[PDB]
Ligand SMILES: [Cu+2]
Ligand SMILES: [Cu+2]
Ligand SMILES: [Cu+2]
């Protein structure tokens with residue numbers, strides 16, 4: 293045992309390592325979406341940047357679990373970061389649609405980690421999850437849903453002027 | 465009853481008083497360690513400062529519990545503040561080890577207190593402990609954790625030179 | 637073929653992609669080292685922040701290749717990011733030496749990539765490699781070289797006082 | 809021989825002269841593009857400025873070859889600047905396609921000149937082209953690529969509203 297460990301079920305230690313991997317997986321996936329929208333035959337730059345930005349955020353979410361792991365005196369165990377499901381993301385609607393899906397999946401991993409922590413009576417982990425992850429997730433989910441709705445209203449995937457307008461007016 | 469009290473169980477109220485006392489008693493102990501490292505024949509000024517500081521922090525944690533008790537409409541009942549376990553602390557390795565035991569004891573008590581709030585369904589108490597204590601507790605524990613490990617690497621207890629160096633390099 | 641591509645050989649494209657992936661591999665390894673030295677029972681914070689830095693820099697080197705790929709009109713294809721080699725890194729010296737190895741390996745793959753660039757006469761790639769990569773590589777290597785030498789002068793692995801001393805005087 | 813000349817092959821000197829002229833031919837074609845979009849019946853002022861500016865740039869590239877020729881001890885020999893291919897450029901999409909085509913022609917020339925700098929073992933010329941042209945060229949090529957992609961998505965050449973949106977959103 294670590295000299296610092298207290299109230300940390302080893303089931304939680306191992307879930308954090310799993311969560312840490314999933315975040316990196318999310319990261320990699322967003323950076324694929326970045327490289328896709330920066331292709332000269334795609335060339336939607338602001339969509340590209342939004343995906344880059346989210347990729348940097350997801351990665352930071354992961355640095356933050358390493359830190360937590362150590363703070364509680366768990367041990368970080370790293371796994372292969374599995375490559376994204378596609379190399380080609382179709383267009384803005386399909387990329388936004390896959391992003392929503394990924395986000396909901398990370399949310400579920402998170403909720404499951406919280407529920408684990410409720411069951412093991414770990415109030416520190418419960419709080420860390422609530423304060424630093426859970427709200428961020430539902431903000432990002434509402435953004436992406438809002439994008440999807442607008443993209444559908446612009447007439448994606450078929451309507452290319454729509455996709456253009458979105459990239460010029462909906463992403464800062 | 466008090467005109468202000470709502471959803472605050474008697475045990476929660478009595479526990480708060482116990483925790484208030486514990487906090488005070490830890491403050492007192494750290495005061496002892498302060499007085500110990502400032503002795504002309506121990507003379508590690510920075511170690512002494514790091515303990516003066518923690519003695520001030522714990523006193524403030526105790527004040528926050530009095531404010532809490534009156535806010536919820538319970539009553540502050542004070543008990544004797546018990547003298548610390550030793551008048552003399554050995555050396556920085558020995559003191560840090562005693563600090564680590566004390567912080568884990570206090571953490572335990574906050575976990576017991578938290579459990580009691582979950583059992584009595586007092587979210588307001590649960591959130592107080594979560595936002596203001598639980599995290600500052602795990603932080604201080606890691607901190608001392610790290611100090612012990614470095615103190616050992618440095619050849620404590622018997623290497624005078626390592627104790628000198630830790631005092632000049634690991635504490636501000 | 638891409639409307640933008642001009643003087644960019646298939647072989648180079650695929651080598652840029654493999655170079656990308658090595659850069660992520662290297663960033664992943666350095667974060668493993670950061671997580672190692674931030675452990676409570678290892679506790680060398682500055683050594684840990686140095687590995688954290690490289691991890692961030694190597695990750696940027698990967699992003700730069702992703703932008704290169706796209707600018708040439710080639711195509712980013714991602715692979716898995718193999719977990720690092722160890723979960724645990726012994727001590728500062730053992731970790732440095734493992735860092736020295738890793739930097740030599742990456743440099744070599746950049747030299748392999750420059751070689752290919754020359755044989756394909758592709759001086760835009762030849763120049764990219766020379767301006768943005770080839771010099772940071774030797775600087776990083778000489779610096780790690782310097783650490784390995786001071787580390788050894790100080791008695792590593794056996795001498796704990798010297799490991800400390802290094803953490804506090806050689807890395808900010 | 810000029811008293812300053814060293815390592816500068818007479819084939820290099822001649823091709824710098826042919827490069828100079830090409831740079832002016834480009835500049836000149838761009839200014840015709842600008843004059844085309846400034847017309848009251850074409851009236852796309854931002855597209856016009858994008859051209860006016862790239863014109864001013866190609867002209868600065870030529871001035872820079874002039875200076876170079878003299879530093880190495882070569883001798884500027886000027887030739888007619890041949891008028892451009894067209895007197896009207898159709899619409900924004902034709903113009904950008906012509907421009908892409910022009911930039912690849914120019915790029916190709918800069919590469920032939922580089923190739924020649926290698927064959928004739930001239931580092932100073934090799935460095936000049938890399939440092940000062942090649943990267944600019946791939947950058948401008950990439951940009952026009954992106955413009956053509958978006959113009960195609962905006963329904964050009966038949967869609968006027970498309971063309972107007974580009975003038976008002978993609979170009980400064
Ligand atoms: Cu965040
Ligand atoms: Cu996340
Ligand atoms: Cu996310």
Ligand SMILES: [Cu+2]
Nearest residue numbers: 415418419594
């Ligand atoms: Cu909670």
Ligand SMILES: [Cu+2]
Nearest residue numbers: 406418419422
């Ligand atoms: Cu909770």
Ligand SMILES: [Cu+2]
Nearest residue numbers: 509510513636
């Ligand atoms: Cu002082």
Ligand SMILES: [Cu+2]
Nearest residue numbers: 521524525600
């Ligand atoms: Cu505090």
Ligand SMILES: [Cu+2]
Nearest residue numbers: 487522525570
């Ligand atoms: Cu406390």
Ligand SMILES: [Cu+2]
Nearest residue numbers: 521522567604
């Ligand atoms: Cu405390």
Ligand SMILES: [Cu+2]
Nearest residue numbers: 520523524527
């Ligand atoms: Cu106070």
Ligand SMILES: [Cu+2]
Nearest residue numbers: 415590591594
């Ligand atoms: Cu709670």
Ligand SMILES: [Cu+2]
Nearest residue numbers: 587590591594
């Ligand atoms: Cu709660």
Ligand SMILES: [Cu+2]
Nearest residue numbers: 681682685808
């Ligand atoms: Cu720091």
Ligand SMILES: [Cu+2]
Nearest residue numbers: 659694697742
């Ligand atoms: Cu690198």
Ligand SMILES: [Cu+2]
Nearest residue numbers: 690693694776
């Ligand atoms: Cu590096």
Ligand SMILES: [Cu+2]
Nearest residue numbers: 692695696699
């Ligand atoms: Cu970056």
Ligand SMILES: [Cu+2]
Nearest residue numbers: 759762763938
């Ligand atoms: Cu070169």
Ligand SMILES: [Cu+2]
Nearest residue numbers: 693697768772
């Ligand atoms: Cu760098």
Ligand SMILES: [Cu+2]
Nearest residue numbers: 831866869914
């Ligand atoms: Cu040019």
